[PDB]
Ligand binder design. Structure first.
Ligand SMILES: [Mg+2]
Ligand SMILES: [Mg+2]
Ligand SMILES: [Mg+2]
Ligand SMILES: [Mg+2]
Ligand SMILES: [Mg+2]
Length: 195
RNA sequence: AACGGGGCGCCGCGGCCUCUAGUGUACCGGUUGUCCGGCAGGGCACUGCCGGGCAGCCACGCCGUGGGGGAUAACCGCUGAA
């Protein structure tokens, strides 16, 4: 359909200061600061008009189609994650599951290393991005923390992907005559806030 | 079975001549028939034939011949509204 005018409002929580800067004809840079840190997000080439009103972020589209109107809900959802990111933080939880070979997960500096995955001599090494903290709880659980939910979720997804074999190395998911097969890996199990 | 780690080929490409192999009517030797009287030296038999062989050329010989980065394909995912 067609939208003459549509508006959305995102209430800024207490202690959070939001700055909106126009870096181009339709580009925006939104800086969000809270007790837990500062996030910076870019909204480039966008039809959404972004503005501040006494403690809210106002999002508007004018003369918009479905494509442009759909971006109001998206930007509201992104901004809400930013506000919760600087007040409560984001924690993604992962579970280590093995069948015969116990995996050894350790964090050394800014490297996350997984050893003995399926008894392989190769070592899975991942680079931990700035703003992400990884802690290994016992032998079964991994926790990824940060203020940028996109950054934190993406890294947690990378850990899970690193243990998913592809091509000729992919094991059969089901066993003989239909039981569970070789299902080893690290699986993202859920998320929650730090506070 | 596999990832990872270690070692080496085959095919192709580019060079090289130290080794080995081929050639080598440069060169040295042996020897057949005849002719120059004999010896020695030599002509011809299209290097007469046979053996060896430097240089050069050469392969059947030796040497070199890789990893990375970027954007992507098939797609797999994150966040994410309509
Ligand atoms: Mg050649
Ligand atoms: Mg000869
Ligand atoms: Mg004589
Ligand atoms: Mg004569
Ligand atoms: Mg002659």
């Amino acid at each position: 359909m067609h939208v003459v005018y549509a508006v959305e409002e995102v209430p800024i929580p207490d202690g959070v200061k939001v700055a909106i800067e126009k870096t181009g004809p339709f580009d925006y840079v939104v800086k969000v600061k809270g007790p837990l840190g500062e996030l910076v997000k870019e909204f480039k080439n966008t039809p959404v008009i972004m503005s501040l009103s006494d403690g809210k972020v106002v999002l508007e589209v004018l003369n918009a189609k479905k494509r442009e109107y759909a971006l109001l809900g998206t930007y509201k959802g992104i901004l809400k994650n930013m506000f919760l990111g600087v007040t409560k933080g984001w924690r993604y939880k992962l579970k280590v599951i093995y069948t015969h070979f116990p995996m050894l997960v350790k964090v050394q500096g800014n490297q996350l290393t997984i050893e003995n995955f399926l008894g392989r001599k190769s070592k899975i090494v991942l680079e931990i991005p700035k703003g992400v903290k990884v802690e290994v709880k016992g032998k079964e659980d991994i926790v990824v923390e940060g203020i940028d939910r996109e950054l934190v979720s993406q890294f947690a997804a990378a850990i899970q992907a690193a243990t998913e074999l592809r091509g000729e190395e992919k094991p059969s998911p089901h066993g003989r005559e239909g039981g569970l097969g070789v299902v080893d890996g690290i699986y993202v199990v859920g998320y929650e806030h730090v506070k």
